[PDB]
Design a protein around this ligand. Structure first.
Ligand code: DQ5
Ligand code: DQ5
Ligand code: DQ5
Ligand code: DQ5
Ligand code: NAG
Ligand code: NAG
Ligand code: NAG
Ligand code: NAG
Ligand code: CL
Lengths: 532, 532
C-alpha cells in the first residue's frame, strides 16, 4: 500500500489527494514531538513517544497558539495568513506530500513558515505543497513550531524556559525527517530547508547553529536572514520582556520558578492578549518573543560567527521582494491606508522614520531622514511614502540579508541571489504596496497553475520557472540545468556580486543589490549609533 | 583740472587712460592710511597724514607683502594672481577710475580683492576697472589691505597686535571713499562694495561689523561669505597660531610685548617663509592668519549675529561658480595634475576628503565619504575626482554661502542669487578643473570686451550682461532694469529660493541651489561633529 507507512514512532495512514488532473499522496498532521502542554509550556520539546495502531494522517493538524490579525475582517489579503485550523498548544505536527508512485531516494524540501516568530501556520492555503511536490517530483515537508511567548520566552539560566525552544521545535522536526523521510521516498542526505520572513531567518539560524547543521543539506532564504534586527534579542533583553510579561499579568516576580509557574497557570490567549505590551518602543517590524543569542543554540554573537566562518559551508539560494516594508507601514504607521494611495505628509514621514528605526538616537534619526529625503521635493507625499517604504524594507530585510550574503559567500560553496519584483495581476492589495513581503510565496508554491485562481499565462510560466529553480537547486545545489538552453542564473561571487530579477520578463543580471542604501544601513549607521 | 582733484588729505593728479577706442580718468596709488611699517606693523591703520603739493597718482602702488605662488612658474593661469609690482609693507593705497567727463554724484563700486586673506593685490590685470567704469558709467574704486601675518596676526588682549587690522584697513579705505569720493564725481550715499573669495567674505564681514555698516549702501559677494570655514578663527586659535609663528623664529614667548617686539624685528619674507607652518592640520583651503571673532569687530559669534539679525539690512547680490574646489585640489591633493585629466584612485580620494575636512573625526570623514561616493562604481576615477571637487566646492564656498543667504534673507531688504557656470573658451587650465574659483572675475571686469584677449562674441555679451547686472544692482538695489523686455532675474525669497544661471545661454531660473548636499554640510555634519 502506497498510503500506509511505518515510521520509527508508529504506523501512519495518509490520503490520496488530487493535483492538476493527477494525484499524489499526502500525510498530514504527523506528530513529531510530545505536546508542549501543562508543565512543558516553554520547555524544550521532547521526542514524540511511539504510538500503537495507525495514525490518521489525512487531516491538517491544529495551529499553534498565536495572535490572530483582525485588522481587516474577512479580507482575503490578510486572512490568508491567519490560522485556518483550531488553535492549541498541542501543535507540533508536520505534513508530507509524496509523489505517486513513490520515488526511490528523491530530493526533500522542508518548508518553515514565517509570521515574525509570533504567528504562522503550516496549513495555510498558500503553503499547499501538492503543486510543488507533484510538478518537480520532490518530497515536500511542512514543519511547524511554537511561536510567540510559548515558543520563545527566554529566561537565560532557567531550564524550564531557556529560550529558542521554537527553534528547537524545528530542529526536532528536521531530526524526525532525518530518521523517517526514507520511508516516504525521501533521501535524508538531500534535504533543502527553505522558509520565508521569520522562516528564512530560521533557515539562516540552522545554518549557524551547530546542533542543526547536520540535519539538512542546502538552504533557501526568502525575505529573511539570521541577522535581521527583528530576528533575535540579547539574553538581558529577553529576560526583561519575559519578566515584563509576568508583571503584565500580576505574576509574582521574585524568582524564575515562581514567574514561570504563574505564566504556566495562564490560558494561552491571556499571554497573547498582552504579548505586544513588552516591546521597548513604539515599533514597526518588531516582535516580542524571538530567538535569543544564548551561548548554546548560538555559540557566540551572530556577527563573530559570520566573521569566523563558524557555520555550515554549503550552497544557499536567497533573495528579497521589491517592497518588503509596505505591509508593515499599512498596519503600523500614520498616513497609510489600504483604501488610498497613502501619500504621506512630511510630518507623517518624520513619525514613520521614528517608528521604523526603534533604536536610533536623535543623530541616527537625522541620518536616516537625510538619507531618504529628496530636499528639492520634501513635501511630495508619494516620494515620502515610497521613501519610508524603502526605509523599512532596507533596514529590516534587504540590507540585513546582503550583509549575510556577503559574509557567507566568503566561506560558502555557492550562492544564488534573486530580486523578486513581480506584482501579481490578481493582487488584492493597493498598488502603492508594491511587491509585498510574502507574495512571492504563492509563485514558489505553484498556485498560479490553478486556472480558477485566474493568474495570467505568463504568471503560470513564472511560477514553473521559479519552482524548477528551487527544485533543481534543491537536487543539485545549482538552480540551473547546466548545458541546457535557458539563460543561466549566475553565481553570486565575492567580487562581482551578481543577482537576477525574478519576473515575467527575460532574465536580467545586475550587480550589487542596493549597495548605496545598504552601505548606510550596514556600515555607517551602526558606527553612528555606537558613537556617543 | 579734470585730472587734478583736491581731496581732504591733499591734491592728487591722475592720468588719462584709453579704453576701447575711448578714454577715461585713473587715479592710481592714492594713499588712504599711514604706512604700517616697523613699529606700526600688526597695529591698527592710522589715517594718512595730509600732504603738500600734488601726489603723482598715475602709476599702480606697491603690493602688500605676501606669499608668491611658484608652483607653475611663468604659467599664465597662476601668474595672473601674483603681485605685479614691488612688495612693501607700505602698501595701503587705493585706485579710482572715473568716466570722462566727470559725472555728478554717480554710483560707486569698491572692489575688495580675495586670496584667502594671505595674498592678493589691487593691481592685477583682471582687477583693471577702466572697462567696468567706462561701460557702466560708474566710479570704480579698488582698495588694498594687509594680508597674512601683517594683516591678521591676532594676540587678543593686546593693542599692539589685536587682529583684524586687515579688515580695518578695508574699513579705513571705505571711510576714505565716504569722505573723498564726492570730489571724484562719486556719490558716497550709493557705494557698493564687492569682492571675491576672501573679498566676498570681507564684504560679508562688513555687513555684520557695526563699525562698518555706514560706510557703504549695499553688497556683492562672489564665491565667499563671512561664515566660510576658512574665513575666521577664534581668539584662542589666533593666539595659538601667533605664538607658534613666534616659536618658528625662536622669538621670546614670555609675553605679547616680547613676542611682538621680536616679530617686528624680522624681515617680511622671514615671516612669510614660516607662515604656513602654523596650521593645526594638513589641510586644503585653509589659511594661517585670518580674521578673529574678537568681540569688537564682530560683537558676538557670526552665527548668533546672523540669528538675531545683528547686521546691516539692505540688498545683496551674490553667487558661486560651478567648480570652486578644482583649483585647491590641484595645488594640495594627491593624484591631481595640471597636465592630466587627474582620474583619482579610491586611495587618493580617501586622502582627498581627509585634507578637505581637516576638522573632522573619523565618523565625520565617513559621513562625507558616504555622501559623495557612488557605491555602484567606487573605482571610477572621474566620479572620484568630481566627487572630491564637489566636496571642496560645497564645503568651503557654496554651502557656507547658502547658509548665509538663507539667514540674511530673513532680515535683508532683497537678495539676488547667481550660479556662474560658463567655462571660458580661451581658458588655460585643463578641462577637468571646470568653472574655476575666481574665473568669473574676468567677466565682472569686462575683459571679454578686449578684442585682443580672444574671447568669443558670446562671452563679450555675457560680460556685458554681467557688468550691467552689477552696475544696475549697485545703482538701484535690483539687477533688473524695470521694463527691459529680456528675462528678469527673480528675487531670492525664504520660501521659493530662486536663483539664476550665468552662462552664454538664455537665463533659466532654479530653486534650492545644491540643497541636498548643503543640508548635509550646513545641518547634518555639524550636528554630527558636535555630537561625537
Ligand atoms: O501593526 N499593528 C499596529 C497596532 N495594532 C493594534 C490592534 C491589535 C491589538 C494589539 N496589537 C498590536 C500592538 C502592537 N503592534 C502590533 C503589530 C501587529 C499586530 C498587532 C499589534 C504594538 C503596541 C501594542 C499592541 C494595536 C496597536 C498597534 O500599534
Ligand atoms: O590649505 N591651503 C590652501 C590653498 N591655497 C591655494 C592658493 C594658491 C594660489 C592662489 N591663486 C589663485 C587665486 C584664485 N583663483 C585661482 C585659480 C587658479 C589658480 C590660482 C588661483 C582666486 C582668488 C585669488 C587667488 C591653493 C591651494 C590651497 O590648498
Ligand atoms: O596646498 N598645500 C600643499 C603644499 N604646497 C606646497 C608648495 C610649496 C610652498 C608652501 N606653501 C603652501 C602651503 C600650503 N598650501 C599652499 C597653497 C598654495 C600655495 C602654497 C601653499 C598648505 C600646507 C603648508 C604650505 C608645499 C607644501 C604643501 O603641503
Ligand atoms: O509590524 N508588526 C507586525 C505586523 N503584524 C500584523 C498582523 C499579522 C498579519 C501578517 N500577515 C502577513 C504576513 C506576510 N505578508 C503579508 C502581506 C500583506 C498582509 C499581511 C501579511 C508574510 C509573512 C507572514 C505574515 C500585520 C502587520 C504587521 O506589520
Ligand atoms: C481518517 O479521517 C478522515 C477524515 O474524517 C476520514 O475520511 C477517514 O475515514 C478516517 N480513516 C479512518 C480509518 O478512520
Ligand atoms: C565547492 O567545493 C568543491 C570541492 O570541495 C570545489 O571544487 C568547488 O569549486 C566549490 N564551489 C564553489 C562555488 O565554491
Ligand atoms: C610720477 O611723476 C610723473 C608725472 O608727473 C610720471 O611720469 C612718473 O612716471 C611718475 N613716477 C614714477 C617713478 O614713475
Ligand atoms: C524692504 O524691502 C521690501 C521689499 O524687499 C520693500 O517693502 C521696501 O523696499 C523695504 N521696506 C521698507 C519698510 O523700507
Ligand atoms: Cl604668549
Amino acid at each position: 500500500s502506497e498510503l500506509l507507512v511505518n515510521t520509527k514512532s508508529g504506523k501512519v495512514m495518509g490520503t490520496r489527494v488530487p493535483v492538476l488532473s493527477s494525484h499524489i499522496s499526502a500525510f498530514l498532521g504527523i506528530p513529531f514531538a510530545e505536546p508542549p502542554v501543562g508543565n512543558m509550556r516553554f520547555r524544550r520539546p521532547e521526542p514524540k513517544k511511539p504510538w500503537s495502531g495507525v495514525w490518521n494522517a489525512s487531516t491538517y493538524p491544529n495551529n499553534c497558539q498565536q495572535y490572530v490579525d483582525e485588522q481587516f475582517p474577512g479580507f482575503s489579503g490578510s486572512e490568508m495568513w491567519n490560522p485556518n485550523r483550531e488553535m492549541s498548544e498541542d501543535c507540533l505536527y508536520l505534513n508530507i506530500w509524496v509523489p505517486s508512485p513513490r520515488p526511490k531516494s528523491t530530493t526533500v524540501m522542508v518548508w518553515i513558515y514565517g509570521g515574525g516568530f509570533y504567528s504562522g501556520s503550516s496549513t495555510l492555503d498558500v503553503y499547499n505543497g501538492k503543486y510543488l511536490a507533484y510538478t518537480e517530483e520532490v518530497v515536500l515537508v511542512s514543519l511547524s513550531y511554537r511561536v510567540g511567548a510559548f515558543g520563545f520566552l527566554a529566561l537565560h539560566g532557567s531550564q524550564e524556559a531557556p529560550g529558542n525552544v521554537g527553534l528547537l521545535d524545528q530542529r526536532m522536526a528536521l531530526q524526525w525527517v532525518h530518521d523517517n523521510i526514507q520511508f516516504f521516498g525521501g533521501d535524508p542526505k538531500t534535504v533543502t530547508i527553505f522558509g520565508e520572513s521569520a522562516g528564512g531567518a530560521s533557515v539562516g539560524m540552522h545554518i549557524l547553529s551547530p546542533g542543526s547543521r547536520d540535519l539538512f543539506r542546502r538552504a533557501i532564504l526568502q525575505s529573511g536572514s539570521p541577522n535581521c534586527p527583528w530576528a533575535s534579542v540579547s539574553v538581558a533583553e529577553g529576560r526583561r520582556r519575559a519578566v515584563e510579561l509576568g508583571r503584565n499579568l500580576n505574576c509574582n516576580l521574585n524568582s524564575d520558578e515562581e514567574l514561570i509557574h504563574c505564566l504556566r497557570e495562564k490560558k494561552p490567549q491571556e499571554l497573547i492578549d498582552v504579548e505586544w505590551n513588552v516591546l521597548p518602543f513604539d515599533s514597526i517590524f518588531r516582535f516580542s518573543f524571538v530567538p535569543v543569542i544564548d551561548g548554546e543554540f548560538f555559540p557566540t554573537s551572530l556577527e563573530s560567527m559570520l566573521n569566523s566562518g563558524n557555520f555550515k559551508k554549503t550552497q544557499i539560494l536567497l533573495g528579497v521582494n521589491k517592497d518588503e516594508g509596505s505591509f508593515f507601514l499599512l498596519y503600523g504607521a500614520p498616513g497609510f491606508s489600504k483604501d488610498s494611495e497613502s501619500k504621506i505628509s512630511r510630518e507623517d514621514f518624520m513619525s514613520g522614520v521614528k517608528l521604523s528605526v526603534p533604536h536610533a538616537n536623535d543623530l541616527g534619526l537625522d541620518a536616516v531622514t537625510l538619507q531618504y529625503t529628496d530636499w528639492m521635493d520634501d513635501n511630495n507625499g508619494i516620494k515620502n511614502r515610497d521613501g519610508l517604504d524603502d526605509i523599512v524594507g532596507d533596514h529590516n530585510v534587504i540590507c540585513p540579508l546582503m550583509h549575510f550574503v556577503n559574509k557567507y559567500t566568503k566561506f560558502g560553496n555557492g550562492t544564488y541571489l534573486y530580486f523578486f519584483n513581480h506584482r501579481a495581476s490578481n493582487l488584492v492589495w493597493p498598488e502603492w504596496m508594491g511587491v509585498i513581503h510574502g507574495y512571492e510565496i504563492e509563485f514558489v508554491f505553484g498556485l498560479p497553475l490553478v486556472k480558477e485562481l485566474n493568474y495570467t499565462a505568463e504568471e503560470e510560466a513564472l511560477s514553473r520557472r521559479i519552482m524548477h529553480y528551487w527544485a533543481t537547486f534543491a537536487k543539485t545545489g545549482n538552480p540551473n540545468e547546466p548545458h541546457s538552453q535557458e539563460s543561466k542564473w549566475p553565481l553570486f561571487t565575492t567580487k562581482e556580486q551578481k543577482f537576477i530579477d525574478l519576473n515575467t520578463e527575460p532574465m536580467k543580471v545586475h550587480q550589487r543589490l542596493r549597495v548605496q542604501m545598504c552601505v548606510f544601513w550596514n556600515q555607517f549607521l551602526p558606527k553612528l549609533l555606537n558613537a556617543t
